[PDB]
Amino acid sequence: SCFVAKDGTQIYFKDWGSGKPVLFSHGWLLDADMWEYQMEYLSSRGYRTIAFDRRGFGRSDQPWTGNDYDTFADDIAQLIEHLDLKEVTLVGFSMGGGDVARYIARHGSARVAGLVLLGAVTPLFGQKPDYPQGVPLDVFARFKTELLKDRAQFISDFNAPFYGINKGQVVSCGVQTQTLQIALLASLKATVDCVTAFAETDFRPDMAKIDVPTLVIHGDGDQIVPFETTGKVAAELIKGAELKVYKDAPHGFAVTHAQQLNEDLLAFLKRG
Amino acid sequence: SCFVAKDGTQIYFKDWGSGKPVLFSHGWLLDADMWEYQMEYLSSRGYRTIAFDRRGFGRSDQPWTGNDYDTFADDIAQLIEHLDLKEVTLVGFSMGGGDVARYIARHGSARVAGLVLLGAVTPLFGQKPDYPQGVPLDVFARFKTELLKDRAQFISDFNAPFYGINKGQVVSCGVQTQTLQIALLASLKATVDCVTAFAETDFRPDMAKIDVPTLVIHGDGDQIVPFETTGKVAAELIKGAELKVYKDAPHGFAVTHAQQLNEDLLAFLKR
Amino acid sequence: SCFVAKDGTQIYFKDWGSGKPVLFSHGWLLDADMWEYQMEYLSSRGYRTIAFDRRGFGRSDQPWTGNDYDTFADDIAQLIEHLDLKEVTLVGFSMGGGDVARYIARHGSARVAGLVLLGAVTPLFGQKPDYPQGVPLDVFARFKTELLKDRAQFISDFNAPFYGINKGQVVSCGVQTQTLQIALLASLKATVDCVTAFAETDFRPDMAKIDVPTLVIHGDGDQIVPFETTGKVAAELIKGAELKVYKDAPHGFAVTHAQQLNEDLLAFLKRGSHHH
Ligand SMILES: *CC(=O)NCC(=O)N1CN(C(=O)CNC(=O)C*)CN(C(=O)CNC(=O)C*)C1
Numbered sequence: 001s002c003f004v005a006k007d008g009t010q011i012y013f014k015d016w017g018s019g020k021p022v023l024f025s026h027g028w029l030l031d032a033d034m035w036e037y038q039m040e041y042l043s044s045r046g047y048r049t050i051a052f053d054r055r056g057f058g059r060s061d062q063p064w065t066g067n068d069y070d071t072f073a074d075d076i077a078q079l080i081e082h083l084d085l086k087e088v089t090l091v092g093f094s095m096g097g098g099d100v101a102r103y104i105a106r107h108g109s110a111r112v113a114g115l116v117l118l119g120a121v122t123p124l125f126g127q128k129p130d131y132p133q134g135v136p137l138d139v140f141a142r143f144k145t146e147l148l149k150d151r152a153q154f155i156s157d158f159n160a161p162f163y164g165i166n167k168g169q170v171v172s173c174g175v176q177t178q179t180l181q182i183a184l185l186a187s188l189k190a191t192v193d194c195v196t197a198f199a200e201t202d203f204r205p206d207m208a209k210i211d212v213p214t215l216v217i218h219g220d221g222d223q224i225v226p227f228e229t230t231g232k233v234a235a236e237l238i239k240g241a242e243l244k245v246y247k248d249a250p251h252g253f254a255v256t257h258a259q260q261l262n263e264d265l266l267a268f269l270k271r272g
Numbered sequence: 273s274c275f276v277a278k279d280g281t282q283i284y285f286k287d288w289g290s291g292k293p294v295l296f297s298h299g300w301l302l303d304a305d306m307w308e309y310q311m312e313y314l315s316s317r318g319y320r321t322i323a324f325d326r327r328g329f330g331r332s333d334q335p336w337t338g339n340d341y342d343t344f345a346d347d348i349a350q351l352i353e354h355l356d357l358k359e360v361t362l363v364g365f366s367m368g369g370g371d372v373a374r375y376i377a378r379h380g381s382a383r384v385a386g387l388v389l390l391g392a393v394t395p396l397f398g399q400k401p402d403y404p405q406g407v408p409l410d411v412f413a414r415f416k417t418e419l420l421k422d423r424a425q426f427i428s429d430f431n432a433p434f435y436g437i438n439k440g441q442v443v444s445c446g447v448q449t450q451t452l453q454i455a456l457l458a459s460l461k462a463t464v465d466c467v468t469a470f471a472e473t474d475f476r477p478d479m480a481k482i483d484v485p486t487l488v489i490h491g492d493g494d495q496i497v498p499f500e501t502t503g504k505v506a507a508e509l510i511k512g513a514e515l516k517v518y519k520d521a522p523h524g525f526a527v528t529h530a531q532q533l534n535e536d537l538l539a540f541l542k543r
Numbered sequence: 544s545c546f547v548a549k550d551g552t553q554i555y556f557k558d559w560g561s562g563k564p565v566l567f568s569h570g571w572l573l574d575a576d577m578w579e580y581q582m583e584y585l586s587s588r589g590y591r592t593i594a595f596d597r598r599g600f601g602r603s604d605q606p607w608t609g610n611d612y613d614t615f616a617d618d619i620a621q622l623i624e625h626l627d628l629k630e631v632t633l634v635g636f637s638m639g640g641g642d643v644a645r646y647i648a649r650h651g652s653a654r655v656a657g658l659v660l661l662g663a664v665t666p667l668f669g670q671k672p673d674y675p676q677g678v679p680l681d682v683f684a685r686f687k688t689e690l691l692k693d694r695a696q697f698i699s700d701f702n703a704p705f706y707g708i709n710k711g712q713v714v715s716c717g718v719q720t721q722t723l724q725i726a727l728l729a730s731l732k733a734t735v736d737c738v739t740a741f742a743e744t745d746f747r748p749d750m751a752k753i754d755v756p757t758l759v760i761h762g763d764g765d766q767i768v769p770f771e772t773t774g775k776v777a778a779e780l781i782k783g784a785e786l787k788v789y790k791d792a793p794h795g796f797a798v799t800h801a802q803q804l805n806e807d808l809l810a811f812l813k814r815g816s817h818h819h
């Protein structure tokens with residue numbers, strides 16, 4: 001399936017099953033395929049599951065412009081409009097946690113039932129004047145330098161810290177191959193611009209505007225997006241939010257802790 | 273090229289050359305690209321060759337619903353009508369042998385000139401109460417368990433028994449990379465649903481409805497689709513079918529025995 | 544993005560940025576992604592960059608017919624008509640240097656401001672009765688034989704001489720993986736047909752019809768398209784052409800000499816006028 005964004009960008013999405021809708025937002029470098037196990041899980045258990053490829057990623061068009069959170073949220077808004085979804089549970093991984101939040105911030109929660117933030121960059125990732133505990137900006141500057149040199153090798157190297165393979169997590173050669181294959185479909189321009197986006201976007205104002213049930217899951221061994229200054233604070237700022245911390249879990253915990261995540265997601269959807 | 277199916281599914285295909293049309297139906301985990309050598313071979317010899325990516329595979333859409341042989345057959349039906357084909361030679365590999373057979377069963381043979389079944393699941397793969405010699409269903413349930421955990425590694429591990437690498441067949445790392453690349457395009461849901469499909473679907477009634485010249489080819493070293501209870505039986509059930517057995521050949525003989533298959537396909541067309 | 548060619552083939556393209564248009568034509572086995580770095584460099588510096596997947600490659604359709612330089616040229620002409628481009632700088636790598644050259648010969652240079660030939664097959668790759676210095680046709684016959692047995696392995700093996708890895712160039716496994724992944728998207732037919740095309744197509748007539756400022760860049764360690772009988776000769780045959788030779792550079796110098804190429808393209812786009 002696809003739909004056309006306002007600026008003319010074609011976005012690829014999957015729409016599986018029937019019942020209450022659940023809309024997934026993927027992380028940096030990936031596409032909708034990072035959700036396949038979670039989507040299959042819930043759709044054969046009576047839910048409708050929807051995942052899209054962010055502009056510049058996967059099977060979607062690769063525009064030069066609009067590689068910003070504001071546009072990402074608006075893309076999501078249009079997907080929901082195109083499908084006429086109601087009572088939507090928004091699920092965001094990594095940087096994809098930003099755009100599900102930014103959606104609610106910009107469009108309200110009229111159509112939203114709940115929110116799930118998986119190892120998300122909310123509320124801030126990068127360091128600010130009034131947020132020194134964040135990740136220094138020279139880290140992300142070093143990313144862009146290597147991306148603009150050899151992004152193929154960078155993605156390949158990203159696998160080890162991402163999955164926590166350098167810390168005794170066992171991930172198959174297949175998953176490593178699949179991760180790199182998907183990553184290479186993406187736009188070099190979108191890859192680099194996203195760094196800027198997720199590094200410097202402040203979602204603290206968004207945190208105040210979330211007025212739906214919220215589940216925050218984060219690994220305490222996450223080497224990419226540090227729990228202490230992201231997930232932990234997100235659960236504090238969002239009213240009535242629940243937190244679950246997976247012990248020793250890495251960034252890419254949708255792979256390593258797949259069964260745990262599937263059950264937590266289902267439990268959340270069945271609340272009260 | 274693509275067409276839009278009844279339910280709205282977009283299906284990618286290739287239409288090469290001109291002449292007598294030959295329509296290819298690919299196996300599990302693969303796509304239209306597995307046919308590339310056969311297609312170039314025949315089309316550069318004055319045939320028209322057509323191959324589609326099955327729903328949920330390759331460059332086609334990935335619908336939740338319709339992952340069954342009845343729908344698979346209707347998809348072929350729609351392709352044929354889209355291209356206004358007549359005197360088609362249906363060629364099917366593995367589970368792809370199912371939907372070509374079901375097509376003939378559902379729509380009749382008016383547009384069909386011939387049928388070729390390559391290491392095909394027909395007439396019946398999995399075990400039934402009235403088919404005890406079939407493959408026990410738990411074998412396929414074990415496939416589902418692994419696929420629902422890590423399909424990426426499953427595909428990767430599948431290369432060895434598929435190609436007969438574990439029996440001293442020679443396949444490059446190139447082919448192995450391409451097989452995994454093509455496989456990873458596929459829908460998880462479609463991959464799983466297909467096991468149910470090829471495991472439990474009965475094509476015995478379909479065998480009676482095949483009224484066209486048929487060539488059955490199967491390798492006797494096949495570690496995936498057992499020759500003894502499929503291909504051997506298919507040739508017996510289809511009226512006037514011809515059987516060729518490739519000695520010690522694996523399931524993926526389209527690769528290992530490519531030249532022989534190319535020659536046998538040409539020979540059939542010139543019957 | 545895509546457009547529909549005359550025969551109904553759909554061709555994928557990228558159209559990035561604003562400014563004077565730069566139109567990239569990729570080489571054998573590849574697609575528009577080989578240009579990502581050049582495209583990002585130029586588009587962040589005031590230029591509009593456009594790159595298509597040749598028919599039978601990348602994300603484009605894979606037709607049986609029309610895998611020849613005439614159609615290739617017409618495909619470029621239809622893209623230019625579709626976006627209504629003017630003052631285009633045509634940039635072609637390897638076999639893609641042939642299709643930009645043929646475009647100019649067929650359609651003229653009304654909409655063309657300049658031409659850049661990178662490791663191009665121009666003016667002639669394969670041997671001829673009146674061009675014995677070309678690569679003997681037996682070599683290309685051998686290519687097809689192998690491609691028609693196992694193209695997947697051929698591409699994988701091709702990485703070494705393509706990037707000059709066998710001569711101590713440093714190329715990451717990532718790049719090697721990317722090159723093989725992209726190449727596998729392509730049609731078997733297009734792959735083989737292109738060999739016939741680049742082996743036998745004579746662009747010598749075309750050279751005489753190129754009336755625009757031209758930059759020829761080639762590496763003098765090129766193992767695929769030999770400098771001495773291609774780039775070196777193109778620089779003589781096209782009137783007013785500028786030549787730049789990258790020392791010990793391989794065929795795939797857009798990877799190994801990325802930064803050098805980027806600055807060379809920008810310099811060329813920013814050139815001044817001459818008096819004639
Ligand atoms: C399989 C098929 O019918 N293909 C043609 C087709 O689907 N369309 C409809 N289009 C789209 O769906 C565009 N994308 C979205 O709406 C997300 C528009 N079509 C084309 O773009 C045709 N031209 C090219 O593909 C270059 C036709």
Ligand SMILES: *CC(=O)NCC(=O)N1CN(C(=O)CNC(=O)C*)CN(C(=O)CNC(=O)C*)C1
Binds near residue numbers: 445
């Ligand atoms: C630069 C280089 O040597 N590249 C080869 C390469 O990276 N691959 C990709 N593969 C893997 O990474 C294997 N998996 C793991 O290491 C977890 C697959 N490759 C091979 O296995 C090479 N040989 C064969 O496939 C026969 C190639």
